[PDB]
Amino acid sequence: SVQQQLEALEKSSGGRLGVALINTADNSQILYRADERFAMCSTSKVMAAAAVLKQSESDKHLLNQRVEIKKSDLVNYNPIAEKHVNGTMTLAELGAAALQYSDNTAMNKLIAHLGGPDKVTAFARSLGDETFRLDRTAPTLNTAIPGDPRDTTTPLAMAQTLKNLTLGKALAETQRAQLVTWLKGNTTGSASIRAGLPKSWVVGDKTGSGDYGTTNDIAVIWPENHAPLVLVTYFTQPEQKAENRNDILAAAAKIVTHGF
Secondary structure, eight states: OHHHHHHHHHHHHTSEEEEEEEETTTTEEEEESTTSOEEOGGGGHHHHHHHHHHHHTTOTTSTTOEEEOOGGGOOSOOTTGGGGTTSEEEHHHHHHHHHHSOOHHHHHHHHHHHTSHHHHHHHHHHTTOSSOOOOOOTTGGGOOOTTOOTTEEOHHHHHHHHHHHHTSTTSOHHHHHHHHHHHHTOSSOTTTGGGGSOTTSEEEEEEEEOSTTOEEEEEEEEOSSSOOEEEEEEEEOSSTTOOOOHHHHHHHHHHHHOOO
C-alpha cells in the first residue's frame, strides 16, 4: 500500500517523485524511483560541508580558519554572507550558513576551499558513494534541467550517504556530531519533510530547490521510541518555471513514516 500511495501521489503531482527511506531498526527500505537521477540543488551543500569536516579531522585549526567575504562573492541568495562583507567568517561559520540558511556564498567558499566541485565529488566517492557528482558552484548547480547529469545523485545513494554521514562511519565523532547539530538547526525546512512528521520528532534536514520546480529535502529523523529513519524526498517537474512543491515532500514523508 505504501508503494500504491506513493504512485498515486506522483500521479497527481505533475512531476517525478523520488523517495528513499532507510529504517535503521532493521536496515529495511522504502524506495520509489530511488535509482533515478535528480538534480540535488542545495541538498549538495551537505556534501561540501561534510568534506570540510573531514579535512578538519586532521587539522585542528581548520574550522576556525578565517575566510574573507567580499562584495564580489555575493551571488543570488546569501542571507548570512551578506552580513559579513568586508569582514571574515570562519570555515565552521560557512558550514553553518550553508546548511542552516542555504547560503550560496557560503557553499561557494566551502567549494573553493576544497579546490573545486570535483573535490566534493571525490569526497563523496571516498564514502563509497558512486553516484553523487558536483559539477558547478552556486547558483548554477540549481538549473536542474531534465536529463542533465550535472550536480545529480539518486535518492538511494543520497540516503545511504546521509546515513553514513550522520549516523555511521563517514566522519569522526566530533565532526559527525557537528554535522548533526547543523542539520538539526536548519531553518529552511519547516514546510518540507518536517511538515509530514509528528511535530515532536527530532529532525535534521537540508532542503534544495531549483528550476524545473525541483524541490528536494534530505533528512535524518529520530522518533521518540524507535531507531532513526533517513529519508530523501526529491521532486522535479517538466517545465522550467514550474513552482516548487514542498507540499509533495511533506506528503511523501507522511506516507512513508506512517505506522510508526
